[PDB]
Write a protein that binds this ligand. Structure first.
Ligand SMILES: [Zn+2]
Ligand SMILES: [Zn+2]
Length: 263
C-alpha cells in the first residue's frame, strides 16, 4: 500500500494508485496536522509501505523520524520536490500544499514516477491513472473557478492559515485568519482586532473548522451581522478513491459558497 500522512495527500495518492495498490492514511479524521503522534502500530505500517507520501518536516512533525529510516526510493516528500520549491508561497513558507492544484499535480507526477519504478508491471495502469487525474482535476478547476468567481470581493476570516494556495488560485479575498497555529488560542486583543476589522471592513463570513470547537469564532461574531460557516482543510467527509481529490476541492468550494453567496 501507499501510506499518506494526511487525508488529502491520500486523495492524490489514491487517484494514481487506483487498481494498482491500496492507499492508507495515517492522520485520523478529526485530528490536526499540527498536533499529532503516530500510533505505536504505525511504525510497522510505514516499514511495510510500498511508498510513503507526506508534505515534509515543516508540516507533519510526527513523520520525520520514521520517514528518515526508509529508502529514498520509497518516499515522496512534497515540499522538497524540485518542481514544488518555486511554487511555495510565504524565511518561512506556507506548507498546506495539498490545497494547491499545481502542487497536487507535481505530487501526482512524483507518485507516478516512484510507483512505475517500484512496479514496472503496472506502468500502463499508472499512466492512465495520471491522465485521468489530470482530466478530473482540470474539470474541477473549471467548475470551482466558476462557483467562486462571483464571491470575489466578499471579505471573511478563517480559523487557521491553511487555505492560501486555494484562495490565490480561485481569486477569493480573505481578510485574514484567527491563528497560524490552531492549537494556540488567539489573544483577547487579536480577537478584538478581528471583531473591529469584521465590522469596519464589512465582512460577510467567519469560518470555523471541524477539528476545533467553534466557540472562540462564535464569540468574535457575537452581536454582529457576520455569518458563520465551516471549512474543512482535511476532507473528513470525503472517502479515499479515484475521484476523491476532485470531490475534496469541490466540497471546499461548496463550503466557501454556502456562507459567502449573497446577500
Ligand atoms: Zn494547518
Ligand atoms: Zn498571520
Amino acid at each position: 500500500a501507499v501510506v499518506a500522512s494526511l487525508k488529502p495527500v491520500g486523495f492524490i495518492a489514491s487517484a494514481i494508485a487506483d487498481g494498482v495498490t491500496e492507499t492508507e492514511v495515517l492522520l485520523p479524521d478529526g485530528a490536526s496536522e499540527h498536533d499529532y503522534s503516530l500510533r505505536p502500530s504505525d511504525v510497522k505500517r510505514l516499514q511495510n509501505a510500498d511508498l510513503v507520501v507526506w508534505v515534509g518536516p515543516e508540516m507533519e512533525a510526527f513523520m520525520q523520524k520514521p520517514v528518515s529510516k526508509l529508502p529514498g526510493a520509497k518516499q515522496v516528500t512534497i515540499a522538497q520536490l524540485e518542481d514544488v520549491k518555486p511554487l511555495l508561497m510565504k524565511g518561512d513558507f506556507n506548507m498546506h500544499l495539498w490545497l494547491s492544484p499545481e502542487i497536487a499535480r507535481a505530487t501526482a507526477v512524483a507518485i507516478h514516477g516512484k510507483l512505475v519504478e517500484l512496479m514496472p508491471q503496472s506502468r500502463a495502469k499508472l499512466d492512465a491513472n495520471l491522465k485521468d487525474f489530470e482530466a478530473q482535476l482540470a474539470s474541477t478547476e473549471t467548475q470551482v473557478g466558476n462557483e467562486l468567481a462571483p464571491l470575489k470581493g466578499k471579505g471573511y476570516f478563517v480559523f487557521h492559515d491553511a487555505y492560501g494556495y486555494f484562495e490565490k488560485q480561485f481569486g477569493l479575498t480573505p481578510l485574514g485568519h484567527f491563528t497560524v497555529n490552531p492549537e494556540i488560542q488567539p489573544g483577547a486583543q487579536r480577537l478584538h482586532e478581528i471583531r473591529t476589522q469584521l465590522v469596519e471592513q464589512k465582512a460577510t463570513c467567519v469560518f470555523a473548522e471541524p477539528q476545533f470547537r467553534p466557540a472562540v469564532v462564535e464569540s468574535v461574531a457575537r452581536g454582529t451581522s457576520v455569518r458563520m460557516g465551516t471549512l474543512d482543510p482535511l476532507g473528513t467527509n470525503i472517502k479515499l478513491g479515484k475521484t476523491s481529490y476532485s470531490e475534496f476541492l469541490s466540497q471546499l468550494a461548496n463550503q466557501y459558497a454556502s456562507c459567502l453567496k449573497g446577500d
